[PDB]
Structures are given as C-alpha cells and as structure tokens.
Subunit: 233 residues, 6 copies
C-alpha cells in the first residue's frame, strides 16, 4: 500500500516529519542536516526524504501551497504512513503593526478565510490548537537561540493575492500576527486524527509597512528553526 500522491513503501517514512513547504527546501534540509538519506517520493516532484539525525530516523516532506494541497499530503502521511508528529517550518507576512521581519512565530492557533471547517461544523467557528508540548519545546529552544520568537495566532489565507486588505488589517488590530496558507489545515487534521502538530514560521515580509527580506537574509534563522523542529520531533 502507498497513498495516491506518495509512492513510499510502508515504513519508509518516520513517525516524525518536517513540512518545509517547497520540495527544494525539503531537499536542502535532508542534504544539509540528515545522514543516510533516502528519497522515498518524487511523485509530482513533491520530494520526500527519510534520514537520521542524532541517531533517530526522521522525515522531511514537501507539501504544496494552500489548505487543499497540504490537506492531501497530511491526510496521507497520518492515515497511510502512521506519522505522529508534524512540524511545518515556513514563512509568513506580518499583519500586526509592530511585528518585525525575521521574527519567528509559533502558531498557537489559526484564523482562516477557508470554508474547510465551516463544512465540517456548520454554524461554528472551529479554532484548531497546536500541540502544546511541541509548542513549548519550540518556544524554549527558540528563546535559547536568541530568535525573535512570538507565540500567538495567525491567519491561514486561501488567497495570496488579495484585492481588499481591510479585514486582514482588522485582524492585525485584534493581535493576529501574520498571514500564511497552510496552518489551519495542518492543525485541524492533526486534531481529527489525535496526532501532534506545530507551525513555526519566519516573518519574511510586512504586508503593510512594506518591509521585506531576502532568503539569504533569512538563512541563519531558518537553519536554527529546522534544528529546533528536528529536536522537537
């Protein structure tokens, strides 16, 4: 048995997994951080690797952009591959006026403009929570490394190119720290299946102040975040 979008053999994927978004970031992580690495998937070029880190097996799996894409992969990892701990390491755009580029956000929960949870719970606002043990580990370890760590809510957006920004500014005004595109799907599915999830994101740019950052510029932060995510897993 393999899932429809992942060609991995049963057992090839570790119980712990990083979800760095771009498949080429998964490759970067595997080559740079992991020993004895296997590439267990190339379907749709969505690279997935298993290797060893401090004597433990651990996986890194590219997902695409957005709730529907990540929901497909997460569903498959949990359901078909028995994956227990899932840490998204990614970027976000700040939407709160004093959040700064290079800040690292640990998502306690996620707001959304997605209908995904509306269908599951008609008439309810479902607010999916992070796994607290993962979150507290990440917080502690990020603080030890001198990362500009914030713990709070984010917005999981369906639309990267949004014509009206009024309501995301408003979410800004109620303390929502940043916007990204996957976290609600990851946290909601982890909760559904009784497994552990966390999103750890770096602010790559500010949506209102215009402040922006280069990927070279985010490299030192990103590398500390991958090590944090790995240790936590």
């Amino acid at each position: 048995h393999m899932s429809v979008h992942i060609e991995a053999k049963q057992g090839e994927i570790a119980e712990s997994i990083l979800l760095p978004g771009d498949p080429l970031r998964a490759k970067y992580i595997a080559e740079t951080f992991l020993e004895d690495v296997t590439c267990y998937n190339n379907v749709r070029g969505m690279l997935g690797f298993t290797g060893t880190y401090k004597g433990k097996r651990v996986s890194v799996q590219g997902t695409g952009m957005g709730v529907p894409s990540i929901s497909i992969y997460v569903n498959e990892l949990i359901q078909s591959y028995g994956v227990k701990n899932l840490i998204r390491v990614g970027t976000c755009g700040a939407i709160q006026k004093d959040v700064k580029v290079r800040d690292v956000i640990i998502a306690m929960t996620a707001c959304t403009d997605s209908n995904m949870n509306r269908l599951t719970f008609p008439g309810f606002d479902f607010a999916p929570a992070a796994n607290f043990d993962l979150l507290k580990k990440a917080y502690d370890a990020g603080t030890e490394k001198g990362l500009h760590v914030r713990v709070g809510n984010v917005l999981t957006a369906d639309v990267f190119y949004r014509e009206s920004m009024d309501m995301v500014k408003k979410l800004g005004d109620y303390g929502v720290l940043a916007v990204e595109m996957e976290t609600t799907a990851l946290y909601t599915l982890a909760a559904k299946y009784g497994v552990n999830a966390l999103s750890v994101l770096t602010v790559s740019d500010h949506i209102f102040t215009g402040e922006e950052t280069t990927s070279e510029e985010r490299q030192t932060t990103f590398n500390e975040m991958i090590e944090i995510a790995l240790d936590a897993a």
Copy 2:
C-alpha cells in the same frame, strides 16, 4: 464609573479572577484573600479586591454566556485599567480521554456564538490566550501535580441544546470541554491589547456521565484558584 460596576477609580486591581457565579467570587475572596473590600453590588454581581501573598488582586462575578461576560470585560478594561484577566470555574468534558478533576487551560476557543462572524464576515476567528499567562499557569499546575490539559474548548452559546451531535463531533476532533464564556474574554482582551486566560476544572464528563459534586472537587478547585492567582500576580 461604568454602567454595570459602581467602583470608584482605583478600587479594582490590575489583575482579576473572573468566576461566573458572584457567590463564588465571594467564596474565593473570603477564602484566599486578605483585607477584602467589596466594590460592587450592582445586579448582585459581587466584586472584591484584596491581597494574595501581599499582592493586590480582584475577583468579579461575570454571569453566564458571552454577552454578559463581554459587558464586564469591556468595562473592567476600559474604565478600570485592568490588564490581566483570568476566568476560573468549571466545565463539562467532551474529549474521550479527559477526566473529572482535570484542569483545562484554553489555548483557544471554538464557538457557535455569532459575535466574531459579525466582526470578521467570511472569516473563522480563532481567539488566542496570552501565552505568558498560559505558560505561568501550566507550569504552576504541573509543579502541583494537577492533570492540566492545554488545548481548545467550546464556548457554547446554548446550555440546553436540542442535539449533542455537533458537540460530540467537536470532542471527536480533540476539543477538550465546553463552557460559555472564553471566546468573549480572549477576543476582547486581544482587541484591547491586554492579557487573558481561562483555567477550568472538569466537574463532569458530558458523554461518559462521570460527575462530581462541588464538595467532591473542592481541593482541585482550590488548587486551580491558587495557580490562577500565581499566574496573575
């Protein structure tokens, strides 16, 4: 003074415990607090200020449901300079592994209330606990040996619900317990830039039918007040 509180300026402390029942606000003030004053008896919604471990702290009845607690939180924050707000009380467990006497620290809340859908049309607002407060309570509770569960809760907008299917499904998706206030607190605290948390003792399990008398859970309850006082001070 505000429309629902007759306190003068300076009669209410910066940090405050927010039970629903005003007779529990009295119990807590008389039990835990020294040099207590009663600054409010409008609507019988008793509120007190005293000292805990030498430090000034208040306790205010909120009444039941989102709309009632919202009035008091708005007025405490806007008129009285309150900065730290901790809801304390009980809840009904709905997740399969949650037990009577467990203490729930809400990371977020789900709701069937329309208060946030009106504010952010088309969005699911996931209101978030203050993390600093939350880590303080968690750490205080764990040091004590309480079975502290950090996760989401359902803020119900109805107590006598016609069907339990949706609350059962929410519990299937990991939602720990049900209560009727925390999304209001978390949302307003976020809106005003102040710090909020909800710490709740499980009095019964809604699906297993495990129940507990308030006498039966008194020392757990006392320890919840303890950790909540520690976190606020």
Copy 3:
C-alpha cells in the same frame, strides 16, 4: 426536583412570572408590588420570588443579561416548573427616530445578531412572535393607564458595546423601535414549548439623539409598566 440553576420546590413558582434581568429589580418588584412574599431561589444570587398581587399568586425571576443567560432560566421555568405566562420587564435604548424616553415598547417580534435560530433553522430567518392575547391585554392596560405604548419590533443585541453603530442605525431607519438583549430567546423558547411570552420595556435613553434618563428619573413609568405586566400576566 429542582432545576440546575433554580433551587425551588415544585409548586413554589406561580404559572405567571415577570422576568427582569436584574435580581435586585426582582427584589424591588416583590417588595413594592407583592404581599406574602417568599424568596424561592438564591443560587448564583439570581433571586426569585413568589408573592400575591390582587389576590393572585405571581412570581418574579432575575434572568441575567443576554440570550444565553435568559435561555437557561426560561428553559428551566417551563420544563421543570410548569410556568405558562412569561413577561420580560426592563429597559431599552431607542433607535427609531420618533421613539422617546419613558415610552413603553411592547415587542411584536425581535430582530437579532444572535446565532440562536440559525443553528435551529439553517438557511431561514426565524421571526419569533409574541403571544397575541398577552400583547393585547398589556397594550389595552397601558393605553388605559395613559402610557405612550408602541407596538413593533426590537433588536435583541448580542453585544452591548458595539464597535460600529451603522447596522443598528439602519434597523432604526427600518422602524426597529429599540435595542435590548433578551427577547428573541424568550419568544423562541415560548414558541418551542407552546407557552405565552411578552416583553414590555421602558425606554431609558435614545441611542442616536442622546436623550438619557436616570433610573430615579423614570421610576414612576417603570412602576406603571410593572403594573400593566402584572395585570396582563394574571
């Protein structure tokens, strides 16, 4: 048998009851209007009393503030105590341009920003109606007394402190008379259980003109509202 939020013995609560939000107003009503009074409930300080008015037993019960709070008490009064006629008394903020302080509003229906009926009838607007017999009795007693009584819709608001007043202004522009926080709960649950409800409200202030009244300034209008609610109820 006692409900969860009411410690009354079976038979201690009359079939007709007034439902003020404030349990200290419940107490004032009982001591001011009623003979041979008993306080049947102290749980949560949510005072409830039974007394006699014009030779009839009638009750008075604090409900707290908002839909979720009144819905608990109303459910328990009907289900556990066989209460049959339920009259919400209290104040309201005028939003229609011709409504005045001291006017008494009798709610034919209520609009709301509460989710309560949206779970129950998804895709529908449910318009909860007052019991017409009660409504008529109170209107007739009000007009005989000389009160400026107005029959129309009200807003049952879920939020006292509203960031924007644009929508409540628009509702007032569409003839919605006043804003308060309870009556849709009462009307819907009364309808659900086949019992009779009415809200009769004194205007305390006008939200858009700024006209305000103190509780002392309107005590006489309020006391007369209570009399007509008691007359309608018994």
Copy 4:
C-alpha cells in the same frame, strides 16, 4: 409613471388591497367598488380604483413571490404615494391543528428568502405588521365569526420544495402557514414608514392534505375583503 405600472399620477388611491391574482382584483373592484377605473393593464397585472363608502381605494394584482411583489410595492409607495397596503390572500397550513378556512393575520414572517440577509448582514430581520391595522382586522374578523388566528407565517421562495423537514419544524415552533409575499410587504412598508398587513385564508393543509375549493372559501374571502376595505378607508 413607474416601470411596471402605467397609471397616471393621482389615479391610484392612498390605500390599496393586494389580492394577488389579477382576476381577484377585478372581482373585488366589480363586486365591492363603485365608479371603478382600471388604471393598469401592463403585464395584465390589473389595477383598479373605485369608491367604497364614499372613499377612494385601489385594488392591485401582484405576482407570486417576494421579487414580484417587491417590484409592485416599491413603485406603489415611491411613485404613487401609497400609505396603506393590505395583502388579502391564501396560504397552506403547516401547523398540525390549523384548519382550512382559518384566517391568519400575520404579526411577522419567517423566510427562505435572502432579501433581508443582503440588507442586514449577520442579522435576523423580523418584519412587523402595522399594529393598528392588525388589531382592527382581528376585532372585525372575530365579530364576523371568522376562524381568526394571529401569529407568524413562513414566506417561501419555493412553492415546490424537495424536503418538508424544516417547514414541519417551523410548525412545531408555532408557525401557522406558508405563503410567498408578506416578508417583502412588511419589510418594504417598514423601510418607507408606511402601513401594511397580511390577512390570509388557509386553502390547504400541507401535511394532512385537506383542501378547499375557491367556492368553499368565498363567504370567508368576502368577509375579509370588507374587513380590508374598511381598514383601508379608516
């Protein structure tokens, strides 16, 4: 001249009956009115003006459903100065004990329609009948031995509905009958500060299957027409 009515200014009276079917408007004009002119034949949606006890009064056919009656009502009020509007119609009973030939005077309307959700996003809008017209009709209806009931109705967009589950549940919450116009009528009258009422005979029972013939309903219809005409002219 409005877009759907060809009447010249002054040819339509202040007060108007809305019998639905244009052939009922013609029936009402010919049987009850004197000195009648037909002011409109556009879309065959016949409108007449005549005198009743010395006072001018109109009778205007409207179409089926919220969107059609909204057209006619808007143009009636805005273009022609109509201040009093009375729907004289029929309905289907959805409540277990409501009977055919019962006459329902609607205090409010529930709805299927989206019309009010666009206007008041996030709100349930509950439109109120004019109370003075309503009590007038109730009193006159009861004096004529009509089987009068005062309550809420369901304004439906869909005459032929897949699932009756929810309209059964509305009956269980005391909703009496289903029709297709009054939420529009009551909402627009409120918006423009004018007076409206719906008075409806049960022609069928949606669940028991009981039905009536136009002839079986006639003596009742004729009493309702007289009641509506008097209220119109007073």
Copy 5:
C-alpha cells in the same frame, strides 16, 4: 392539470418559450405562430401553442422572479412533459463592453437568491445551460448577424436595489447583464434532466445609462425570438 395551468394533456408542446410578460407571450404567438390556441388563462398567465416552420411549439408567461418562474417550470416539466425550455426577454447590461441590443446567451448565472444555498449548504451551485440548445442558438444568432455574447448573468432577487456596488463589482468580474429568472430555470431543468436556455436582449446599460425603448429594439427582439424558436425545434 397542474395548479397554475389549466391545459389539457397534449395541449402544450415539448418545446416552449418562456417570456416573463403574458402579453409578450400573446405578441409572440400572434406575430410568429400559425394555428394558435390559448390553452391557459389562470392568473391571466397566458400560454399558447401554435406552429412555427411546420413544428408545434408553445409560449408561456412565467411572471417575474425566481419564485414565479419556478412554479411554472415545475408544472410544465412534471405535469406537461415539456423537454426544451427557453427563457426569452430583456436584460440590463453591467459589463463594460456590452451594448444595448446585444443578445446574451447565458452559460450560467450568479444569484443573490438563497434557493440553491438552501439546497446545497456550504456550496456555490453554478447552474449550467444545456450545451446543445446553447450552441444551436449561438450558431443561429451569429448566422443572423446579431451580436451574441455567451457568458454569465446575474439572476437578481431585487429589482430596486439599495446599493449598486456589488452588481458593479460583478460587471468588473465579467458578468454580462442582470435579469431575475435564469438560476431557477437552469437548476430545475438540470434536476429533472431536461434542456434549458436563456436568450435575452440588452434593453439598457445599468452604468453607461445607454438605453432603448421597446419600440426602438423591436427588430432585435424579434430576431432573438426567431433564433430561440429555431434552437427549440
């Protein structure tokens, strides 16, 4: 006999045109048909059957709005065995390049009606024209020289709209024109497995204010009915 149509079985043709106005149905039958019979006078909602190019065909007034047309379409399908239903009439243009006298052939419709949300809670239902009918009508129209535009329309529930900002926004998103019926026709035809289409003449432009009298656009209207008739048979 259905409840709103008094016709005998066999008196209504399998192919039918559906103007809103019954007097426009009268005009169509008198202007275009031989051997015409008026088969319905209930509510004065006139319906006719006559012969066009050797073929029996009907014309039936539907009145105005989703709820009216739905009554008529249900009955024609379920009681009278009708197979092809083509709505004819006028529309108000809202897209910037659409002109008066253009003919709109609706591929789909948007709507502010709740009819379909109620049936498919959580979903936007997009009703489809029957492609066969649509292609026939398009070829007939382009053969004739008419400026036929194929795309979407707004099936509006209100004629007198408080604000035009949303219909303006729909025009900006390419929605061609506004009318009040096609969602009902397309959804019901599709539900019962029959064939439907709307072909409409632009009477005016909502935003440019270009307008046309019924007399001024008569020739275009007449050619529109010709192509509808040809498509139907």
Copy 6:
C-alpha cells in the same frame, strides 16, 4: 521583472498556456508535443516550458493542487507575463451516475466548496464561465478525435478526502458531472482580468461506482486531450 513564484524573463512565456497540476506532466507535454523547447522555471520545482507547436509558440506550466495554488500561478501568469488563453488539462472523479471513466469533461462552469468567491461577493453565488470560443473549439476537436466529450458543470473541491459524500452525491443528482480542485479559481481570475480560460478533464475514476483507471489506460485519451487543448489555445 519576475513574479514571486516564477523565475522567467519577460516574454519567455507564450500568450497561450496549458496548465496541468503536475510539473512532471508539464515536462512530459513539452518533451512529447513541443519543438525547440526551453524550461523557463523551476522555482519550487514547478516546471514551466515554452516550445513550438504547429509553428506557434506555446507554454506549459505546472500549477499544483487546489484553488490557492492554481490562483497564485494564474495571477502571476496574467499580471506578470501577459498570458491570454489558459487551458487546464487534468483528471477528475465522476459523481454523476451516467458519467464513465475516460470521459472528457469540458467545464462550462464550476460549483464550489471554496469560500474564495463568497468573500468577494457576500450573499451571492458567483458562477464563473469558461471562455465560450475556447470551449466550442475544444468540443469540436474532441468529438472529431472520438473522445467521449461531455459539456457541463463540475465541482471544484477544497477537500480531496471528504468524510461525507452526501452533498457531492446530491450535486451529481442535479447534473454536475465530476469533481476536481482548480477550475473555479482559473475561470474566476480569467474573467476578472478579461482573458480566456477553459478546463478539459479526463475522468480517472467514479466516486460512487468505484470504477478506476490506470494512468496507462488513460494515456491515449489524455494524449488526444492535450492535442485538442494545444489546438484550441493557438487558433
């Protein structure tokens, strides 16, 4: 100027473009049907190529899965690279009782699960339409090649693994043909920017009967589908 997710120079991408979800499928199309081919992108490994087909420049670009992924690429293609005709080629699951595997669905419109359009038009059901000239072209070309072409509505889903299938079942009862995950985004944005879109889809499986198909079993049908989409895009 490059867009944020595409590393192409201005003018490297043709005005007509095919949009498979899978980048390795874009590669297959380019290598198999195109001459003089250049790979202009692999940021995120979301491969894009430009080549020539019947003497005309045409491009092929992976979009990824779901409304939010395809919306990103389509926005950037139109706004950053001036693309004008856009055809999604893909597979779908049949949800209507008479639709069969290997049918090719040409989507007139899309129903949806997504809140994308409800946000933009509160209180409205927005129904986005294919470009009709593209649609008519594809239909004629596909029927000539003997494809099992159907013209109708589809469902654009946010969820691949749905817990309950009852609404999609009901949607099928109302004539919706199949389920996929992208076309409401493609049609909506295309119409917003005044450009031309179509989705042409091969049924790979049937949601309710369970009939399934191998990618080998789909290949002759998919190959023809690619050609009619190229034909329709360049004409």
